[PDB]
Amino acid sequence: APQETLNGGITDMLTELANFEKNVSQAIHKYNAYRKAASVIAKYPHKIKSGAEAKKLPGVGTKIAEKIDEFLATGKLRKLEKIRQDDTSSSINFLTRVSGIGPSAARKFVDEGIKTLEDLRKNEDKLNHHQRIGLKYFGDFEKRIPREEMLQMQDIVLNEVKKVDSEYIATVCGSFRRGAESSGDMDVLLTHPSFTSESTKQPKLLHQVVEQLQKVHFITDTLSKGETKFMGVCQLPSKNDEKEYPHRRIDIRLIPKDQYYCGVLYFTGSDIFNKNMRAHALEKGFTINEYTIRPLGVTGVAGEPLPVDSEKDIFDYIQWKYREPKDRSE
DNA sequence: CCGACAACGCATCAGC
DNA sequence: GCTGATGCGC
DNA sequence: GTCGG
Ligand code: NA
Ligand code: NA
């Protein structure tokens, strides 16, 4: 893709604003608008020379075009400079970097004097369990995960899941399944045949898997766990003397077999590929989401979901050719 | 002008 | 105690 | 903030 140099100043700029609307203003939608604007500009193989020029790209509007002109004519953005110096905003911004601390908690902390990691360390019992772990692994969580490690992590997850029960089936999705050379977290999708839409969700299916992983000491902390979704912390074992790997984020989801592959495709993305998958499913005459695919009658009314026992199955339906996960980037 | 913008499982907080 | 709202994960 | 019914 284009070199950051090209419009990195613009992209960094728009990203900064994005984190601001997200952490300080609590405007998730504006956050995404800036994020989106930033992406489409990041893939633009041209050094932008005017706000008007950017505006031609989808996702960029009047406001941002104006902001792009100012940045090109002055080298900065006034609203942005006054934000960086605002000790309140910059404090709230920093604190959200801790997993578990959202815009609300971050606002509350800042208000009562808590503004730095140190302050967080001093006020333990003012943090919930999730937040304490985020603090405990602040550094680690901001590190990316190299592919070779996902592999190692994957080797362990499979071995253990299989060591628990042969019938299980687990699939590490996310960008990784598509060959990404680095991941931000592992997202394991799991399922057992003894579980369908109308089947005993056996409160030990997911449990016994988390159970095993805890035994082999791969999973080091739990952020949340229920009957269908687990969010915790994991870590690859080090070798004698050798430095230990950083703790990583992992999520394990239990999906009913009749929805498994349907979800496998979903949480495998990308998102842009999932939409070209969305719109197409429409024309052909099918409704797609993470759980099922349903036939659409002549008046929107979707009939009962169709059987699926593989990603291809879903592909054959919309009469599309199975597009390998490596080429689903779009 | 004005609503959608992805979504929902879980932990915790508010209220009865 | 229970039901519903809200905060959070990106 | 941007898109679009
Ligand atoms: Na535009
Ligand atoms: Na956070």
Q: Are strands A169-172 and A248-254 parallel, antiparallel or unpaired?
A: unpaired
Within window 231-260 on A, which residues have Cβ closer than 7 Å to strand C?
231, 249, 251
What are A252's strand-pairing partners?
Answer: A188, A230
Closest to A92 in 3D by CA, of A30, A41, A19, A160: A19
- At position A307, the amino acid (one-letter code) is P
Are A104 and A26 in contact by the 8 Å Cβ rule? The answer is yes
Residues A74 and A94 in one domain: no
- At position A228, the amino acid (one-letter code) is T
Residues A33 and A57 in one domain: yes
Q: Which nucleotide is nearest to A253 (CA to C1')?
A: B9
Ligand 2 centre to CA of A327 (Å) is: 32
Residues A230 and A164 in one domain: yes
Query: Domain end: A42, A60, A86, which one?
Result: A86
Give the tokens for residue A66.
């104006």
Are A21 and A31 in contact by the 8 Å Cβ rule? The answer is yes
Look at residue A40 and give its three-state secondary structure: helix
What are A153's strand-pairing partners?
Answer: none
Query: Domain end: A122, A143, A164, which one?
Result: A143
Range of the domain at A242: 144-266
Closest to A36 in 3D by CA, of A71, A9, A64: A64
Give the tokens for residue A240.
């004698």
CATH of the domain at A136: 1.10.150.20
CATH of the domain at A150: 3.30.460.10
Quickly give A222 CA vs C7 C1' distance in Å. 18
Query: Domain end: A53, A71, A86, which one?
Result: A86
Closest to A186 in 3D by CA, of A152, A153, A140: A153
Residues A48 and A116 in one domain: no
Residues A27 and A73 in one domain: yes
A293: part of which helix (H) or strand (E)?
strand A293-295
- CA-based angle A56:A61:A65, to the nearest 5? 80
Domain count for chain A: 4
> What is the maximal distance between C-alpha atoms in chain A?
67
A67 is an active site residue:
yes
Residues A14 and A111 in one domain: no
Residues A91 and A70 in one domain: no
Q: Tell me which of A30, A56, A63, A67 is the catalytic residue.
A: A67
Resolution in Å, one decimal place: 2.2
- CA-based angle A101:A97:A188, to the nearest 5? 85
Cα–Cα distances in angstroms (integers) from residue A117 to residues A3, A21, A114, A190, A321, in the given order: 34, 22, 9, 36, 51
Nucleic strand D under 7 Å from the C-beta of A35: no
* Cis amide leading into A91 (omega within 30): no
A53: part of which helix (H) or strand (E)?
helix A51-55
How far is it, in rounded angstroms, from Cα A41 to Cα A45? 9
Cβ neighbours of A288 (radius 10 Å): 22
- CA-based angle A196:A200:A201, to the nearest 5? 75
Give the tokens for residue A196.
């369908």
